Write a protein that binds this ligand. Structure first.
Ligand code: HEM
Ligand SMILES: *[C@H]1CC(=O)N(CCCCCCN2C(=O)CCC2=O)C1=O
Ligand SMILES: CC1(C)[C@@H]2CC[C@@]1(C)C(=O)C2
Ligand code: FES
Ligand SMILES: [C-]#N
Ligand SMILES: [Ca+2]
Lengths: 405, 106
């Protein structure tokens, strides 16, 4: 299905690219998107797929568009095909006054000060889950670590007890995974009805957990409503879930095939923070965009009001004009440049929590399972979309090579 | 190179900042919670507001158009030496710069 070409799009800017099914996907989703950056491809192309839309292919244009509040919206017109990924827990009709107040409140919950204080417990959580898999010699990293880890981290933030683990895991599973006979609204409402009694409870006698901070927040000089509070908690739980899960799987897939990169981090663990930033560049996975709010000539291309323009966050770091040899993973890379968490006023508010989860994951995994690889005869399949991902990551190792810590 | 962050209560935070790192990134990476840096450093949020010491104001590169229009949104008092510290990139010429951190960014 290919949409008609708008009258203002010249033929030479038309490029064959389906963001949900790119042609070279078997080489890896990042590589599949990099066909947009081959030598003969314009910096700004139009694709007939998915209703027709622009794609900026270079970091320079991607950064400028996200900064240019005059002609580019702040909200994304690209609706994810899945119902769960399309829901905005904080409505899109909000004004900049309310947008700032919600960013402020989310910053009280997952900002850098909070991540520092909780790092020791995030460390204990990673160790507990990895040590639980260490003697098995096998695991589906996606299902057995990548998915439980950030869910459990939300429970630490939100002060939730451990006996709620299977229920909250099951509920987030109904929302994120389209498989299963339950609509997203029913799963989302089921999530809400788990939060409402704890929200109403901690509104009277609060504490300093995430739910208490949100329940006691103020919006427009008055207490935050119960509806606003449950939406905030739902956003904080399921907002980051897919990208964290998939990025960890991208990173661990690469380390499973890269013994020399593992040994580099085992011998010199002080380089794990730098290595995490290089993995964030190389395995960037978000590809969203904006919509034109007025006609604008952008880098010599006529854009019209209402045109959808994809501004893939993942392409900025893969751009050879930004990072030489962009497919090379160099933990000593001098000037790591990317927009993996986005760019501009809506940059990921979970960026600090996300970086800490990656650094602790690599630290605690390589200490206990320093050597591992893909299960033989396994076919790792990538998926492409607004959030690209890994279907499954079967890993195997020899338990005698592991070290309990 | 060395940067000193003076909090609102007079507390001093003397910090060694690498060449090429913004004053926001250094603060955020080193427990200086009084600097938020919500937008990640692209002059898009005004949550990295700091007051530059008058000794170093004429040495640091001046503010561009985006920083000034963004500085209008600071929640603390906007002073003529107010800067967005994510636009202040550390160079050895700025060794010893002192910045006063407002009582609020949000
Ligand atoms: C590897 C991990 C992650 C990556 C790559 C990532 C990337 C992104 C990107 C590209 C955006 C859009 C930025 C923009 O529109 O300018 C975003 C927004 C957002 N992220 Fe993440 N993120 C990650 C982890 C997390 C985590 C752990 C949380 C925890 C709460 C989170 C919560 C959010 C929220 C709520 C938004 C919406 C921000 C807004 O609309 O103002 N993310 N993220
Ligand atoms: C960090 C990454 C990058 O490309 N870059 C600019 C390149 C020149 C800066 C390197 C030389 N240098 C220092 O090492 C400190 C100050 C300086 O100019 C970065 O700054
Ligand atoms: C598309 C999403 C639902 C997914 C999680 C939050 C969201 C808006 C993203 O930017 C990634
Ligand atoms: S960090 Fe957002 S403006 Fe300085
Ligand atoms: C963000 N997901
Ligand atoms: Ca109900």
């Amino acid at each position: 299905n290919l949409a008609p070409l708008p009258p203002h799009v010249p033929e030479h800017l038309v490029f064959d690219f389906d963001m949900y099914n790119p042609s070279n996907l078997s080489a890896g989703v990042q590589e599949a998107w990099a066909v947009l950056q081959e030598s003969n491809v314009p910096d700004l192309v139009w694709t007939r797929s998915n209703g027709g839309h622009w794609i900026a292919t270079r970091g320079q244009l991607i950064r400028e568009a996200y900064e240019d509040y005059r002609h580019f919206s702040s909200e994304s017109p690209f609706i994810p095909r899945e119902a769960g990924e399309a829901y905005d827990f904080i409505p899109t009709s909000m004004d900049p006054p309310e947008q700032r107040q919600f960013r402020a409140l989310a910053n009280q919950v997952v900002g850098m000060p909070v991540v520092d204080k909780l790092e020791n417990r995030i460390q204990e959580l990673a160790s507990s889950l990895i040590e639980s898999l260490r003697p098995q010699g096998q695991c589906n990293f996606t299902e057995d670590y990548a998915e439980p880890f950030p869910i459990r981290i939300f429970m630490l933030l939100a002060g939730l007890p451990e006996e709620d683990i299977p229920h909250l895991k099951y509920l987030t599973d109904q929302m994120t995974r389209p498989d299963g006979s339950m609509t997203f609204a029913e799963a989302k409402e089921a999530l809400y009805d788990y939060l409402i009694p704890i929200i109403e409870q901690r509104r009277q006698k609060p504490g300093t957990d995430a739910i208490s901070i949100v329940a006691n927040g103020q919006v427009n000089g008055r207490p935050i409503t119960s509806d606003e509070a449950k939406r905030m908690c739902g956003l904080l739980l399921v907002g980051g879930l897919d990208t964290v899960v998939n990025f960890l799987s991208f990173s661990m897939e690469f380390l499973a095939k890269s013994p020399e990169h593992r040994q580099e981090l085992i011998e010199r663990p002080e380089r794990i923070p730098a290595a995490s930033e290089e993995l964030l560049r190389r395995f960037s996975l978000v590809a969203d965009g904006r919509i034109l709010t007025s006609d604008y000539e952008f880098h010599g291309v006529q854009l019209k009001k209402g045109d959808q323009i994809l501004l893939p966050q993942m392409l900025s770091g893969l751009d050879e004009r930004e990072n030489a040899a962009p497919m090379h993973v160099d933990f000593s890379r001098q000037c790591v440049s990317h927009t993996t968490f986005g760019h501009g006023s809506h940059l990921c508010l979970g960026q600090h929590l996300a970086r800490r989860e990656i650094i602790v994951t690599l630290k605690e995994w390589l200490t206990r399972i320093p050597d591992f690889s893909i299960a033989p005869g396994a076919q790792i399949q990538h998926k492409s979309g607004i959030v690209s991902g890994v279907q499954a990551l079967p890993l195997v190792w020899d338990p005698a090579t592991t070290k309990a810590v | 190179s060395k940067v000193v962050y003076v909090s609102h209560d007079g507390t001093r935070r003397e910090l060694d900042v690498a060449c090429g790192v913004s004053l926001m990134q250094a603060a955020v990476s080193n427990g200086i919670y009084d600097i938020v840096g919500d937008c990640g450093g692209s002059a898009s949020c005004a949550t990295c507001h700091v007051y530059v010491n008058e000794a170093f104001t004429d040495k640091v590169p001046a503010a561009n158009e985006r920083e000034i229009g963004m500085l209008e949104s600071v929640t603390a008092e906007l002073k003529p030496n107010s800067r967005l510290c994510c636009q202040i990139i550390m160079t050895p010429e700025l060794d010893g710069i002192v910045v006063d951190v407002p009582d609020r960014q949000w």
